[PDB]
Design an enzyme around this catalytic site. Structure first.
Site, PDB file in Angstrom:
ATOM      1  N   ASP A 157     -11.662  -1.259   1.364  1.00 15.40           N
ATOM      2  CA  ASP A 157     -10.779  -1.029   2.470  1.00 15.40           C
ATOM      3  C   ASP A 157     -11.578  -0.838   3.766  1.00 15.40           C
ATOM      4  O   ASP A 157     -12.728  -0.433   3.698  1.00 15.40           O
ATOM      5  CB  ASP A 157     -10.070   0.294   2.136  1.00 15.40           C
ATOM      6  CG  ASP A 157      -8.927   0.530   3.007  1.00 15.40           C
ATOM      7  OD1 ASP A 157      -8.236  -0.450   3.256  1.00 15.40           O
ATOM      8  OD2 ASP A 157      -8.726   1.642   3.504  1.00 15.40           O
ATOM      9  N   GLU A 211      -5.015  -6.153   8.397  1.00 12.79           N
ATOM     10  CA  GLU A 211      -3.995  -5.162   8.729  1.00 12.79           C
ATOM     11  C   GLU A 211      -3.802  -5.109  10.216  1.00 12.79           C
ATOM     12  O   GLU A 211      -4.624  -5.593  10.993  1.00 12.79           O
ATOM     13  CB  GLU A 211      -4.388  -3.786   8.241  1.00 12.79           C
ATOM     14  CG  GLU A 211      -4.811  -3.701   6.783  1.00 12.79           C
ATOM     15  CD  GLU A 211      -5.033  -2.272   6.352  1.00 12.79           C
ATOM     16  OE1 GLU A 211      -4.519  -1.373   7.052  1.00 12.79           O
ATOM     17  OE2 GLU A 211      -5.725  -2.022   5.335  1.00 12.79           O
ATOM     18  N   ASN A 236      -4.824   4.891  -2.087  1.00 13.44           N
ATOM     19  CA  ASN A 236      -6.106   5.205  -1.499  1.00 13.44           C
ATOM     20  C   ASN A 236      -6.796   6.314  -2.291  1.00 13.44           C
ATOM     21  O   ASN A 236      -6.211   7.354  -2.619  1.00 13.44           O
ATOM     22  CB  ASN A 236      -5.959   5.533  -0.009  1.00 13.44           C
ATOM     23  CG  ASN A 236      -5.317   4.368   0.794  1.00 13.44           C
ATOM     24  OD1 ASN A 236      -5.955   3.364   1.065  1.00 13.44           O
ATOM     25  ND2 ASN A 236      -4.070   4.531   1.182  1.00 13.44           N
ATOM     26  N   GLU A 257       0.862  -1.172   0.000  1.00 13.07           N
ATOM     27  CA  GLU A 257       0.000   0.000   0.000  1.00 13.07           C
ATOM     28  C   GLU A 257       0.903   1.227   0.000  1.00 13.07           C
ATOM     29  O   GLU A 257       1.955   1.216   0.594  1.00 13.07           O
ATOM     30  CB  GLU A 257      -0.888  -0.002   1.244  1.00 13.07           C
ATOM     31  CG  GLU A 257      -1.977   1.045   1.220  1.00 13.07           C
ATOM     32  CD  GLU A 257      -2.828   1.097   2.493  1.00 13.07           C
ATOM     33  OE1 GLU A 257      -2.608   0.303   3.453  1.00 13.07           O
ATOM     34  OE2 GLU A 257      -3.731   1.956   2.513  1.00 13.07           O
ATOM     35  N   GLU A 265      -7.819   1.731  -3.564  1.00 16.79           N
ATOM     36  CA  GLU A 265      -8.470   1.284  -2.320  1.00 16.79           C
ATOM     37  C   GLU A 265      -9.421   2.375  -1.861  1.00 16.79           C
ATOM     38  O   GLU A 265      -9.008   3.513  -1.810  1.00 16.79           O
ATOM     39  CB  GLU A 265      -7.429   1.093  -1.195  1.00 16.79           C
ATOM     40  CG  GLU A 265      -6.215   0.239  -1.490  1.00 16.79           C
ATOM     41  CD  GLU A 265      -5.518  -0.282  -0.230  1.00 16.79           C
ATOM     42  OE1 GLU A 265      -5.696   0.246   0.895  1.00 16.79           O
ATOM     43  OE2 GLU A 265      -4.750  -1.235  -0.350  1.00 16.79           O
TER      44      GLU A 265
HETATM   45 MG   LIG Z   1      -6.007   1.466   2.417  1.00 16.68          MG
END
Ligand SMILES: [Mg+2]
Ligand SMILES: [Mg+2]
Ligand SMILES: [Mg+2]
Ligand SMILES: [Mg+2]
EC number: 3.1.4.52
Lengths: 131, 392, 380, 380, 392
Positions: E295, E352, E233, E175, E265
C-alpha cells in the site's frame, strides 16, 4: 453547434448554471462550423451528437467513417458520450460498432413516439433485455 | 484625453459608414478607415500611432486578425475593439489570443454601434491609456516598398526543416520555409514579410523563387540516394491561376523530378476560403502524383467535405497544439481525435513546434508519429541541410 | 478586522475542517449552516456578512439558490467559493456571481491552504469605474432615478414635452450617466428592468403634471432589444390604464441605428404603440444610409437630431443644408422635429432662421430630477 | 525611471525581438551584445546596469561565464533570465545567481509578454534581513572587518590576549554580527573566504602590536568545516612567515560542539597547529557529553566557558561548582581558562573567589575595531 | 520577543542532550523535550501553543513526520526546524510537504547545532511571528484518553470503498476503512485517531473490531453471489504478535470464509520498517491464501527484496500520485514504471484518489486498470455498500 455560435453574449451564464446544477449538456449537430474542436475544448459538454448524414454516407464515403472514428476518439479522450443519429438498418448498426460508437438514435430502434407509445417501447425493451 | 486615434477595419461599405458616422460624433480625434489590407497597412505605415483599432474578425475582403498580428509587430497600436459580438464559448480564447499579440482588449462594439456604448469604450480606453505600453515606431517591420525591392533583388532564401519520426529522429522529409536575407536587418522569418506579400499579391513571386531553389536541393538529395521529399507552402491566392499545376509540372520536368518527389501544403483556412475553380489545381497536383498536406489543421471537420475525393496524403497539426498541452490539457483530446482521423484516412500526421522531450514523449503516447521542431532540427540553409542529411 | 464570514457546507467533516481553518486567519465572527434552510435563517436575523462561502462543485443546485437568498437579503458583500473553479469557466462563474449583485472575492479548494485564505482577506480589506455587481445591486435597490429634460419651443419660452433620462444615485460616486452603466446593463440584459422602474416613475410624474393642468408630453427611450419582447406594448397600456393617463400623454424614442439591428418582430410592438396613440420618435436621425427611406415606411410622429448638427452649423454649412432639408421633411409629413444640444443664443436664432420649432440643450434646461422639473414647469 | 538594461542574446532575430519588446516598457537606455566578449566590453566601459538579461537554456556555458563577468565588474545589480526556468530547479537556479552576488529579479520566455516585463520592473523599482546576494557582494568587496575583544586578567587591570571577531560594515544597515551572515556563509561555503580576510587583517594588527612591544595574543575562530581542509595549517604558517610573526603570537578557537561533528581528518590540521606552537582553545566548553574525555585526548592550551555560566552563578550554585571544577581542571593540566560575558563587579570578584584568571565581557571591553583596540592597548 | 516555546523531538538521548543544552543557552523561553510519540503528543496536549518544533525526519523510536501531521491538526504549532540537513535534491519537496501541513519552515539545524546558527533561526522566527496564523487550541483533535474510550465503547465502524475498473466502473473489490462515530464530533476519518492509536498501541484493538465487522459483510456478499474480496489494513506493529496469522485464520474459519475471500494491506514504509520475525506473518497469510497488497507504493524498489518470495498479489499507488499529475508531470513517468512493474510481476495495480474524469482518462492512457476514489464511490457504511453491490 451553430446555434451556440449565434448565441447571445449572456449565454454562458445559463450554461454554467446548468453545468453547476448537474444537468447534462449536449452539443448537437456537432461539426457544423468553423471551430468545432476548439469550441468543445472551451466548454465541458457531457455529450456530443452526430447528424444522421454521417451514418448515411458511410457506404459511399470512407471519409464519413473517418470522421466518425475521429469523433469516437474525441469523446473517449474527453470522457464524454457520443450519440450517432440516423441508424436506419442493421448493417449500419454493425459498422458503427466496428468504429467504436456506443449510443445511437434512429428508425431501427424507434422513431419519435408520444408518451404512452414510448412507455410501452420502454417496458418491452426492458423485458427483452431480461432474456 | 486628446487626439485619440481610431482605425476602423470594415469591409462592407454600409457598415463602415454607419460605424464611422457614429465615431465622428463621439470620438475626439481622427477616425481612420480601411476597406482592405492594402489601405490598412498603408494607413498604419503613415501613422505614428494608432490608439484603437476597431476590427471585424470575419471579413470577406480582408483578414482582420492577420492585420492585427502585423499591427502588433508595428509598435503603433494600443487597443482593439471587436465589431462582431460573436461566439460566447470562444470569447475568452479570442480575448487571450488578442492579448498575446501585445494588444489590449477594450471590448466589443454591437452591430447597432450605439453612441452611448461607444463613449463607454472611450472612457474605458482613456482610463487605461497611461498603464499601456509606449507606442514606438519599430523600424524592424519592413515596409511594403521595402519588401517589394527585397523580392526584386534575390534576397529571399529557402530553408529546410526536417520532418522526423518521434521515436528516434529518423529523417522522413522536410518543409521548405521562406527566409529574408535582409541587407541590414539580418535574417527574417515570415512574420516580417509574408503578410505584406499576401496583401500585395507578391506571394506567387516568392513561391517561384523558392520552389526552384528547392528543386535544386531535391535534385541534390536524389543524387545522394536520399529519398527525402520536400514540401512547399502554396498560398490560396496562387490557386487563382488556371496554370499553376501545369507550371509546377513543367518545372518538375525541367529539374528531372517526378511529382512524387515533392509535396505542397495549404492551411485549412486557405483551403476553406478558396473558390472551387481554384480548388481544381489541388485535384490536378493530386492526379500528377504530388504529395498534398493540409496545414495548420485542428479546428474541425468541415474542410474534409469541399471536394469529391480527399486529395491529401498528409495532415499537419497547428504548432499551438504542442504549447497548449500543459496550458490546456483538453487539447490532448483533439490531438487524439486527429491521430484517429489520419489513421482512418490512411494518411500521415505531422505535429509541429515540438521543443522539449517531455512533449515528444507525450505526443508518442497520444499516437503521433512524425514531427517537426527545435527539439529535432531548426530550419537550415541548403548546405547545412544537405550535411544534416548524412546520419541515419 | 473584524470580519463576519458565513460558511455553507453540508458534509459535517468538511464543515469541521473549513471553520477550523477560518478561525486561524479570520479576525472576527464565523457562522455555520448544514444546508440552505439553516443558512437562510442565519441570514433572516443577522447584520452585515463580509464573506459568504459555499461549494459549487459538490452541491450544486442548493449552492446557487443559497447565493440568491444571500443576494435577496441585501446582507452579503463578497463570495469565496470553497472549490477551485475550472480555468475554462472562470469568467462564466465570476459573471454569474456578479449578476447576483455579489462580489467575487475568490475561490479555493478544501481543505483550505492557510496562506490562500490570507491572500483573499488581504485582497478583501484592500477593497476599502462601477462593477457589474454594483450595477445589479444599485438596480435591485432603487438607486436609479428618472431625470427630465424639457423639449421647449425655440421662439418664445415654450414648453412642449420632456425626455426622461436615466440617472443613478451612487452611494459613493453620486449621480452618473448611462455610459457608466448602460454597458453593464446592455451586456447582461438588465435594460428592461431599468426601463420599468423609470417608466413607472415617469408616469407618476406625468400624473402630478396632469393634476397641475400641464400638457407636458413625456418621452422614454426604448432599447431595440425590448422591441422584440412579446408583451411590451400590452404592458405599456396596462400601466397607462393603472395610472389613468392617456396613450398620447406619452412618447417612445428609438435611435435610427438601433432600429436597424432591431429584432424581426419589432413591428408588432410598433404598430401597437402607434394605434394606441403613443407618440413615436426616431432619435439620432441621419445615422444610417436609408434614413429618408425609413420615415417613409413608418409613421413616426417625431424626428430628433443630435448635439452635433447644432455645433457644426457655424463652421460647416452642409449641416445647415441638412437641418433645412429635415425641417422640410418634418413639415411635409406633418410631424415634429427636435434639435438637440442648443447651448447658445446664436445657435437658437439660427435654428429659427432655418425653420426648426422644438429644441433641447443647456440653453433652456439641463436634465433635472422630479421636483426641480415640476418647479421648472410651474413657470412659463 | 530611467533604468539601464543590458541584454546578452546571440541569435540576431531573437536579439531584435527582445530589445524591441524592451523599448516599449523600459524607461531608460538599453545595451546589446551578440556574445560574451562584446558584453564584457560593454561592461569594461559603462556605469551601473540595473538589469542584466541572458538566456541560460539556449546557451549555456557562455551565459554562466558572462554572469561571472557581470559579477566581477561590480557593475550589475539584478538579473532577468530570458528563458522560463524549470519548476524543479527553480531554487537551484536562483541560488546560483545569488552566489554570484547578483540579485535574481525574475525569469521569462522569448518572445517576451509585455505585461510580464512590466511586473518585473514594478517589482524591481519596488526594491528601493540581508540576502545571500548581499553577503556575497559584501564579501567580494572588503566590507567585512575584524573586531577585537581583549582577554584580560580578572584581578588587576590585566591584558593577556584578544578574540578576533567578524563584523560587517553594511552600506545601509551598518555593523552586524555573525547571525546576520554566518547562516548564509555556512549554507553556501564562504566561511573559509571570510576567515582569510580576517586572518590577514588580524596579523597586520598583530604586527602593529609587536611594533609597540605588546604580548597580546590574537585568537581566531576556526569553523569545523575548515578543519577538514588539506592545507589550512600549511597556509596559516605561510602567512605567519610572510608576516614575520611567530606561531605562538596567535591562537585558534573551535567550539566543543563543532569539534564533535568535525571531518575525519581534522586531526591532521590540529597536530600541525599544536607542533607549530600556535595556541589552541576549546571554545564553549561543557556543551557535549564527553567534554572531560576530550581535554584528555587533545592537548588544548586553553578552555573557554561562555556567557551563561557567569549569569547563572548568583541564582544557580551548580554553575559555581562546575566553574570551580573547571578551574581545577585547567589548573591540573597547566592551561588557561577564559570565562566569558563578565558584565559586573559582583561577577568579577566571585570569579576570583572561585579561582578563574582570565575573562571577557562588557565590564572590561566590548569588541572593537583595529584603532580603538590599539588605543585600548596603549594603556594598562 | 517573549516566552518562545520550543519542542525538540529527538530519539537519541545524546543528540537530544547536545541540542537541548545549546537551546537552553540561547532560547528565551521554555525548551520542551520528547523522546517518543507518547511524550510528544502528551506535551502537545498539555501545551497551549508550541512556537517551534525541532524535528528529525528519520528516527528509530518515533515517526517525526506523523507527529508533525498530528501537530498541524492541533492548531498549536507555528514553525518547524529540521535537525537533519539531508538530501539536496529532495529538499524543496520536503519543504513544500511541511508547508502544505499548515506549518512554517524556518530552516535546518546542522548536526553541529552551533549556537550562532540557533540565534539566526530565532531572529528569523521572531521576524515572522506576527505574519503567522494564530495559534488556537482546536477541540476537534480528540485526546488520547478520548480516543481510548471511543475504542472501548464500540463507536468505530467499518466503511467500504470499492475498487473498480477504470473503464466502466465495474466492481472488483473494496478496501475496509476505519471511521469514528464520535458521540459529539460526528464521523471522523483516520486523521483524527489513527496516529494516536498507533502511538499508544491500540491499533491491534481497532483491527479486531473492524476485521469482524468486515467478515460479517464479506459473508453477506458471498451469500449474494457477489465475489467481492475485502481488504484490511494491517499496521506494522500488529505484525509483532507471533499469532496474528493464526488468529486471522481462526476467525476466517469462524465466519465460514476461505482465506481467498480476503486481502491485507501494509504500507511500503511499514513493510520496510518491520523486523524479519514480524515479516513471517505475511509469509503465513500468503501461504494460507489471502491476498496481500503493498500500500502507498511509489518511492522506489528496495522493498521488493526484503523476503525470499514476493508475497504480494497487489500494489497500490499512493493517493498523491493522481494529484501530482498536472502539478508535476514527471510523476506520470513513475506511474508508467509502476504499471510496467506490476505487469512484470503478474500482480494487480490500484491507483487511489481518482476524483475527476480527466484523471481517469489519463490513468487509462498510462496503462492503469483498477482504481479507487470519489469519482467512482465514496467510503460507505455496510448497507449503502451492500446496496451499492447490486448494479453490474
Ligand atoms: Mg490501504
Ligand atoms: Mg506548412
Ligand atoms: Mg433620446
Ligand atoms: Mg570564540
Amino acid at each position: 453547434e451553430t446555434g451556440l455560435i449565434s448565441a447571445p453574449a449572456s449565454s454562458l451564464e445559463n450554461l454554467v448554471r446548468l453545468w453547476i446544477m448537474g444537468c447534462g449538456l449536449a452539443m448537437d449537430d456537432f461539426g457544423a462550423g468553423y471551430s468545432s474542436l476548439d469550441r468543445l475544448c472551451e466548454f465541458p459538454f457531457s455529450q456530443i451528437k452526430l447528424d444522421r448524414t454521417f451514418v448515411q454516407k458511410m457506404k459511399t464515403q470512407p471519409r464519413s467513417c473517418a470522421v466518425i472514428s475521429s469523433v469516437v476518439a474525441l469523446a473517449q479522450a474527453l470522457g464524454i458520450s457520443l450519440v450517432v443519429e440516423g441508424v436506419e438498418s442493421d448493417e449500419q448498426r454493425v459498422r458503427l460498432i466496428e468504429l467504436g460508437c456506443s449510443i445511437a438514435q434512429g428508425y431501427l430502434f424507434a422513431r419519435p413516439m408520444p408518451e404512452q407509445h414510448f412507455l410501452d417501447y420502454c417496458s418491452g425493451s426492458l423485458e427483452h433485455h431480461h432474456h | 484625453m486628446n487626439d485619440l486615434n481610431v482605425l476602423v477595419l470594415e469591409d462592407e461599405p454600409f457598415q463602415r459608414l454607419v460605424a464611422v458616422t457614429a465615431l465622428k460624433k463621439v470620438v475626439p480625434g481622427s477616425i481612420l478607415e480601411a476597406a482592405d489590407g492594402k489601405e490598412a497597412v498603408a494607413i498604419l505605415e503613415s501613422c505614428g500611432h494608432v490608439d484603437i483599432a476597431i476590427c471585424d474578425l470575419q471579413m470577406s475582403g480582408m483578414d482582420g486578425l492577420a492585420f492585427l498580428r502585423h499591427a502588433s509587430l508595428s509598435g503603433k497600436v494600443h487597443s482593439v475593439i471587436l465589431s462582431s459580438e460573436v461566439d460566447p464559448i470562444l470569447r475568452q480564447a479570442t480575448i487571450s489570443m488578442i492579448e498575446c499579440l501585445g494588444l489590449n482588449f477594450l471590448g466589443d462594439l454591437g452591430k447597432p454601434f450605439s453612441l452611448e456604448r461607444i463613449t463607454a469604450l472611450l472612457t474605458r480606453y482613456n482610463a487605461r491609456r497611461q498603464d499601456l505600453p509606449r507606442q514606438i515606431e519599430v523600424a524592424e517591420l519592413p515596409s511594403v516598398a521595402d519588401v517589394v525591392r527585397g523580392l526584386d533583388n534575390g534576397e529571399f532564401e529557402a530553408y529546410y526543416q526536417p520532418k522526423v519520426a518521434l521515436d528516434g529522429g529518423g529523417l522522413i522529409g522536410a518543409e521548405v520555409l521562406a527566409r529574408w536575407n535582409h541587407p541590414h536587418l539580418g535574417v527574417l522569418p515570415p512574420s516580417h514579410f509574408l503578410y505584406v506579400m499576401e496583401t500585395y499579391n507578391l506571394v506567387d513571386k516568392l513561391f517561384w523563387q523558392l520552389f526552384s531553389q528547392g528543386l535544386a536541393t531535391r535534385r541534390k538529395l536524389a543524387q545522394l540516394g536520399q529519398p527525402i521529399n520536400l514540401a512547399f507552402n502554396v498560398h490560396p491566392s496562387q490557386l487563382g491561376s488556371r496554370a499553376l499545376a501545369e507550371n509546377i509540372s513543367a518545372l518538375l520536368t525541367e529539374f528531372h523530378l517526378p511529382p512524387s518527389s515533392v509535396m505542397f501544403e495549404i492551411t485549412e483556412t486557405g483551403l476553406i476560403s478558396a473558390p472551387a475553380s481554384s480548388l481544381e489545381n489541388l485535384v490536378r497536383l493530386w492526379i500528377m502524383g504530388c504529395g498534398l498536406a493540409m496545414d495548420d489543421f485542428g479546428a474541425g471537420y468541415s474542410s474534409l467535405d469541399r471536394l469529391c475525393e480527399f486529395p491529401f496524403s498528409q495532415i499537419k497539426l497547428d504548432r499551438t497544439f504542442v504549447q497548449k498541452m500543459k496550458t490546456q490539457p483538453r487539447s490532448c483530446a483533439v490531438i487524439s481525435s486527429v491521430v484517429a482521423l489520419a489513421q482512418a484516412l490512411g494518411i500521415s500526421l505531422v505535429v509541429e513546434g515540438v521543443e522539449s522531450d517531455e512533449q515528444r514523449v507525450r505526443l508518442i503516447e497520444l499516437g503521433c508519429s512524425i514531427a517537426q521542431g527545435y527539439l529535432f532540427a531548426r530550419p537550415m540553409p541548403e548546405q547545412h541541410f544537405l550535411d544534416y542529411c548524412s546520419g541515419s
